[PDB]
Design a protein around this ligand. Structure first.
Ligand SMILES: Nc1ncc(CC[C@H](N)C(=O)O)[nH]1
Ligand SMILES: Nc1ncc(CC[C@H](N)C(=O)O)[nH]1
Ligand SMILES: Nc1ncc(CC[C@H](N)C(=O)O)[nH]1
Ligand SMILES: [Mn+2]
Ligand SMILES: [Mn+2]
Ligand SMILES: [Mn+2]
Ligand SMILES: [Mn+2]
Ligand SMILES: [Mn+2]
Ligand SMILES: [Mn+2]
Lengths: 313, 313, 313
C-alpha cells in the first residue's frame, strides 16, 4: 500500500504534555522501515512544526483553542497535500484533537469518506457540553454537519466546515461516554459498537456490520481514527485517559486487518500515545510496540503470514 | 432502580477471616454515593450485627454450623424486610454461605424468583458430600427442594425451608466443581454454563439462553448471587478460592448489564471479597473496584453511556 | 483413557538449551499422579536417553541435523511401541523437532491419523526455505508427502518417509509464519485457523470446523502436537519463541476438552516448555501449570466437573 507519513507532535488538546513525543518514539521503533519491509511505498512528510501561540486564554471553559485550532488547520492542509499525491495519510499524534484537521484535510480531497473511530470515548462533546474543556474530547462535534449551529465560534476554528454526516461514522470500543455525548448518539442516530456490543456479537460480527454499514450503499474512502486508549490499558498503558475493559491486542489487530483487506483505507490516525505516562520503561515499549503492530496491520501485515507472488519452492 | 443495602460481615462459612471486611471496603470505595450518582434511590439498612456464638463445635465434618446458620437466619429476615419496602436487596458479604439466608428471605416475599449464580463453584455440596466442611460451599444444597431429605438436621438450620427447584437456577462461570456436585447437576437436570460453554457460545448467547431459560414461561423476580471468584483472579485476586481461567472483566459487566436491562433484578449478592488476601494494596483495590463496577452495572451503568430524559443540546 | 508416557529431553532443534528439562519439571509437577487421580491408566516408558553426537556440523544452514535426526528416529520407535501396547502416546518435550519422530512412529501403527497442530508457528520450513536453520521450525516439511522432492538428503533423516498429506493436518493458533511457509500453506491447500480466524469465528466454531474437517469423511486416530507457545506468553512465558496475541488459557482448555470428547485422541505432544527462560520462578511455574492443565484436559478433566458412575447421594 502507498503511504504518506505525517508527524503531528501536538498536546494542547488535553492537560498532559508527553503526547507530543508520539511521532518520535513511533519512528524510533522503526515504523518507517518496518512498513518498507512490507509491500509498502513510504514517503515521510516530516513532523509538523507547531509554532507557539503564547496568547491563548480559554474560550469560556475551552482550553488552548487557538493552539488546537491552528494545529488542526496546519494538519488539514498537509493531509490534503498527501491525498493529492495519491497516498494514504498516516498521522502520528499527538492528542486526538488533531482528528479535526486530519478528517478535514482528507474530506477536501475525498468528500465521500467514511470514518471508523476506535476509541474508549466518543470525543463528541461540544464547547457547550464538555465539562473538562479539553478539545481532544470534542473533535467529532466540529466535523458533524448535524451539529452545525450548536458549535459556537471558538477562536482558532473559523476555518472549519463540517464535512461528515452522523451516518458516515462508526464508533468501536466505547466504554466512557459522557451524558450529553450519549444524548447526541441517540439523537443523531449514530452507529456505534461499545464494549457491550463487542462482548455480545464478537469482533468478527462487529467488523462485518461496521464495513457493511459504511460500504453497503457504495464503496468509498475509509478514514481510520485510532485512539490507542480504545485498546485495554494492559496493552497500551502509556496514554492519558486509560479505561479498563478495553479491546484486546487481538481484537485491535483484527479490526485493522479487516480494514486493510477492504483495500479502501485512505486515512489513518494513530493517537494518544504518551510515553511519559508509562509507569515503567516496559509500559512505554509495550504501548509503542502495540501501536506499531496496529499500524503495520493497516498496511498488509497478516497474522496468517504474507508472501510475494513468486515460487518459494 | 430502587435499592436496599444490607451489610453482611460474616466469614464462618470458610476458614479465612478477612471476608467480614467486605461491607467496609465496598462502602469505603464510595458504593452508596456512586449508586446515587446514578438514577438510584438508595436506603442503607446497615451492617448486620452478627453476635458471637462461642459454643459451636463441628456437626460431623461441618464447621461453625450454628454461627453460619444464625447469620443466614438473621439475614433472611432483613432481606424480606427490604423486599417488603419495595426495594432490591443488595447484600454485601461476607462468604457465600449467607446466600442461604438471602435467597430464603427473598423467596418469602417473592416465591416465584429465579436465581442466576455467577461463581467458579456450584456451592451445592451437602453436609454429607462436602469434604471440606466449609458451608460457603454448601449454600445451594439447603435451598433446593429436590435435595430435601438428603440434608441432615444441622444445628443452626432448623429454620430453613427449601424454596427453589433445580429448574429455577442457572449457573454461570463454573470451573471447579466437586464429583458429588457434578453428580447432582446431571441428576437434577440443573441448567449451567461452565467456562467451557462460555468459550463455545460466547457470553452473549450464554446470557441469551440464561434469561430465556428463566423467563421463557413467565416474567418473574431475579436473584443474582455473584461470587467475585467467578471472575478471573487477574480481576478479583483478593478472594479466598481463586481459580484461573475465569470470566473476564468485560464478561462480568456484560452479564450484569443484561440482567439490569430485563428490569427484573430483585435480589443481588456481592460475595467473597476478602481484602486481607490481596498480596498487595493494588490487588485489594483492583478487587474492590471490580466488585463495585459489577454492582453499578446491575443498577443502570451502561458502557455505551447513560443520559437523563432531557435535551442536552 | 489409557496413556503411554515418553520423556523426550531434546533441545538440538533450536539454540536454547533449557527445553531438555521439560520432562523433568512436568513430572515434578506431579503429572503422572494427577492423570492417575483421574480415570487414567498410566504407564511410564521413561525419558529417552539421547546419546551425544559430538560430530555434527551444519548441513548447509541446517543445525545439528544428525542429533535431531537420531532423536526423532529413536522417538519414532518408542511411540510405535506404545501404540502397539494400545496406549495414547504422550510425548513430553523437548523442542518441536521431535514431532518428526512422534508423528512418524504413530503413523507406522496408525497410517490413517489426522494431525491438529497448536502452535504460533507452522513449523513447515524446508532445509532450503528456512533462514534460521533450526529444525524445530521444519518438522512438518519432513512429514508431508506433497513436499517429498523438495527435502534434500539431510544427514540423520535417511530413515524418514513422509506419512501425511497436506489435507490430513489442521493448524490452530498461527501468528508468526515465514513467507515461504505461507506460500506452502496456500500452495498445498493446507487447512489453518490463525489467530485472525479464531478472532473472527470464536474457538467454538474453530474447533467445530477443525474436527469436521478431519473426521468428516471417516473417524480416524487423532495426533495432537501442542506447542506451548501457541498459547499467549502471559500463560506460557518460559518458552523459546513467545509471540504476543496468543490463544488464551481458556481457549487452550477448550481445544483439548473438545479433542478429548471425540474419544479419538491417539497421539499427543506437549512441546517447547523451557524452564530456564522464565524470568522468574513464578513464570516457570505458570508455564508448567498451564502445560499440565492442557494435558489433563486431553485425558478427561472437564471444567464443568467429572464424577464416577455411582450414586453420590
Ligand atoms: N481521547 C480521549 N480521552 C479522553 C477524551 C475525552 C473524555 C471526556 N469525556 C472529556 O470530555 O474530556 N478523549
Ligand atoms: N465460593 C466458594 N469458594 C470455594 C467454595 C467451595 C468449593 C469446594 N468444592 C468446597 O466444597 O468447599 N465456594
Ligand atoms: N516452535 C517453534 N518456535 C519457533 C519456530 C520456528 C519459527 C521460524 N519461522 C523458523 O524458521 O525458525 N518453531
Ligand atoms: Mn480520542
Ligand atoms: Mn480515548
Ligand atoms: Mn460461592
Ligand atoms: Mn466461588
Ligand atoms: Mn513448534
Ligand atoms: Mn511455536
Amino acid at each position: 500500500r502507498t503511504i504518506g507519513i505525517i508527524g503531528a507532535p501536538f498536546s494542547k488538546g488535553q492537560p498532559r504534555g508527553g503526547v507530543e513525543e508520539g511521532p518520535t518514539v513511533l519512528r524510533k521503533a522503526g515504523l518507517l522501515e518496518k512498513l518498507k519491509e512490507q509491500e509498502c511505498d513510504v514517503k515521510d512528510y516530516g513532523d509538523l512544526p507547531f509554532a507557539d501561540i503564547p496568547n491563548d486564554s480559554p474560550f469560556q471553559i475551552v482550553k488552548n483553542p487557538r493552539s488546537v485550532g491552528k494545529a488542526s488547520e496546519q494538519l488539514a492542509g498537509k493531509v490534503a497535500e498527501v491525498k493529492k499525491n495519491g497516498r494514504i495519510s498516516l498521522v502520528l499524534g499527538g492528542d486526538h484533537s488533531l482528528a479535526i484537521g486530519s478528517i478535514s484535510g482528507h474530506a477536501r480531497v475525498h468528500p465521500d469518506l467514511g470514518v471508523i473511530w476506535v476509541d474508549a470515548h466518543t470525543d463528541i462533546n461540544t464547547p457547550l457540553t464538555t465539562t473538562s474543556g479539553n478539545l481532544h474530547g470534542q473533535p467529532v462535534s466540529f466535523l458533524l454537519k448535524e451539529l452545525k449551529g450548536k458549535i459556537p465560534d471558538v477562536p482558532g476554528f473559523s476555518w472549519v466546515t463540517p464535512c461528515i454526516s452522523a451516518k458516515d461514522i462508526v464508533y468501536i470500543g466505547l466504554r466512557d461516554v459522557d451524558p450529553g455525548e450519549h444524548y447526541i448518539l441517540k439523537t443523531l442516530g449514530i452507529k456505534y459498537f461499545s464494549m457491550t456490543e463487542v462482548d455480545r456479537l464478537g469482533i468478527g460480527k462487529v467488523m462485518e456490520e461496521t464495513l457493511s454499514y459504511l460500504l453497503g450503499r457504495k464503496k468509498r474512502p475509509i478514514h481510520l481514527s485510532f485512539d490507542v486508549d480504545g485498546l485495554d490499558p494492559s496493552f497500551t498503558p502509556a496514554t492519558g485517559t486509560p479505561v479498563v475493559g478495553g479491546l484486546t491486542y487481538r481484537e485491535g489487530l483484527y479490526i485493522t486487518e479487516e480494514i486493510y483487506k477492504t483495500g479502501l483505507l485512505s486515512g489513518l490516525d494513530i493517537m494518544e500515545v504518551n510515553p511519559s505516562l508509562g509507569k515503567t520503561p516496559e509500559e512505554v515499549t509495550r504501548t509503542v510496540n502495540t501501536a506499531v503492530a496496529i499500524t503495520l496491520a493497516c498496511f498488509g501485515l497478516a497474522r496468517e503470514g504474507n508472501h510475494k507472488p513468486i515460487d518459494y519452492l
